[PDB]
Amino acid sequence: SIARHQDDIAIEQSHFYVEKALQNRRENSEQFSTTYSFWTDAYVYLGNRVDADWAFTKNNLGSVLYTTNGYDGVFVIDDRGTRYAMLEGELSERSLADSLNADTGDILRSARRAAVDEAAISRYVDFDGAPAILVASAIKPTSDHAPIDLAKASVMVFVDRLTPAKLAKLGGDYGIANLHLLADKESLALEGTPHRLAWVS
Amino acid sequence: SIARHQDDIAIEQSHFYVEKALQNRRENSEQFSTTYSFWTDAYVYLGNRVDADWAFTKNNLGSVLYTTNGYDGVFVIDDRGTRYAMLEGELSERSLADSLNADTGDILRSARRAAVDEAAISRYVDFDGAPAILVASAIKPTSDHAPIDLAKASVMVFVDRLTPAKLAKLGGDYGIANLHLLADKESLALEGTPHRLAWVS
Numbered sequence: 001s002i003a004r005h006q007d008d009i010a011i012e013q014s015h016f017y018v019e020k021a022l023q024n025r026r027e028n029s030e031q032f033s034t035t036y037s038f039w040t041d042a043y044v045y046l047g048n049r050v051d052a053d054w055a056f057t058k059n060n061l062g063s064v065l066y067t068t069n070g071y072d073g074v075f076v077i078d079d080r081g082t083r084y085a086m087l088e089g090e091l092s093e094r095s096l097a098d099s100l101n102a103d104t105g106d107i108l109r110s111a112r113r114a115a116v117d118e119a120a121i122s123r124y125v126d127f128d129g130a131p132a133i134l135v136a137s138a139i140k141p142t143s144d145h146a147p148i149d150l151a152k153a154s155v156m157v158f159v160d161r162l163t164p165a166k167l168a169k170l171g172g173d174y175g176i177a178n179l180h181l182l183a184d185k186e187s188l189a190l191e192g193t194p195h196r197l198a199w200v201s
Numbered sequence: 202s203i204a205r206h207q208d209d210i211a212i213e214q215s216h217f218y219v220e221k222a223l224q225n226r227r228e229n230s231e232q233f234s235t236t237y238s239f240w241t242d243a244y245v246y247l248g249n250r251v252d253a254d255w256a257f258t259k260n261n262l263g264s265v266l267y268t269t270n271g272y273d274g275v276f277v278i279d280d281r282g283t284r285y286a287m288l289e290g291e292l293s294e295r296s297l298a299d300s301l302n303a304d305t306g307d308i309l310r311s312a313r314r315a316a317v318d319e320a321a322i323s324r325y326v327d328f329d330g331a332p333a334i335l336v337a338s339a340i341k342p343t344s345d346h347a348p349i350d351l352a353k354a355s356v357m358v359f360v361d362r363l364t365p366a367k368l369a370k371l372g373g374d375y376g377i378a379n380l381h382l383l384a385d386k387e388s389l390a391l392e393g394t395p396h397r398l399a400w401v402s
Binding site: 013016017020023024028031032034035036038039040041057058059060062064068069118142143144173174175 | 214217218221224225229232233235236237239240241242258259260261263265269270319343344345374375376
């Protein structure tokens with residue numbers, strides 16, 4: 001019953017589909033993270049001492065996560081810090097905390113709590129000065145295994161850096177013109193980061 | 202320079218986002234399928250004789266694929282037919298061919314060809330009278346393993362049945378009103394099936 005300016009309708013549509021693009025991307029990475037972490041073999045070879053031979057050399061948690069799945073950062077963390085790091089498909093000694101603005105302990109504790117509900121967590125992070133989607137889930141074995149203490153579980157972390165190419169393809173997948181990191185246009189904040197995504201509308 | 206009826210613009214937008222919803226869903230399931238099939242452990246325990254204890258009892262390819270990932274059908278096939286079937290998270294003796302309209306040999310051959318390019322295949326199928334997204338990828342070990350003959354590789358198949366609830370959630374994820382299986386409205390065909398998806402516009 002309220003007539004609206006056409007520019008206002010297109011601006012609302014663009015905001016709706018930018019938010020949906022981010023939301024669908026997060027939920028999908030959450031299930032992907034749970035697929036890799038709710039895994040008995042992952043629990044054996046990554047939940048205690050990190051077997052980088054099994055993870056990287058044998059490609060059970062290796063470079064394909066970057067060259068195929070596009071996760072610029074794959075990490076295993078526990079109470080002592082980063083136990084395994086793969087940046088751009090290569091093994092690294094760099095910790096998760098050094099590459100993030102968010103608190104690593106908060107990520108560890110939150111992922112352990114979500115695992116109770118068979119869930120992962122996600123959030124936006126500042127990843128080396130760039131916006132990124134972070135998902136994390138506890139490393140635990142499946143129900144056929146004897147129960148473990150989720151309070152001491154290691155946590156698997158997948159970092160999705162929103163590069164200009166990724167934003168260009170993601171916006172195209174949702175019909176949004178010139179989705180980019182804001183350096184007139186529409187914009188929204190990635191909460192928990194200083195970054196804002198912008199687009200034409 | 203050409204002015205257009207507002208109903209025509211909304212109809213074109215709705216078609217764009219129904220097609221994008223299906224496309225993004227297919228591409229995502231293709232990477233998920235490749236994650237499960239390009240796997241040395243999967244090659245050992247599913248690429249030859251099917252170890253249902255490893256797959257289902259030990260939950261390495263088990264009911265979570267349905268109760269979490271929503272794949273109503275998970276199959277392993279080879280030149281002799283269906284070697285492993287899980288319908289709605291339960292082991293089954295029903296073959297993939299009996300539950301499909303598409304040719305099982307075509308799926309096997311096509312997935313073996315796509316594996317050369319490290320890719321999966323996808324298509325729409327008639328799955329027990331319902332529309333469905335099928336993805337398939339060859340079961341092969343990772344590059345650290347000695348090379349195998351892709352012509353004799355088993356193929357992993359994930360079937361995503363587009364139930365009314367799934368279409369309701371998928372359409373909502375893309376701002377489409379009343380996405381459903383067509384029994385005035387907009388419509389498109391799922392090629393390779395007798396099914397058409399319909400929505401309000």
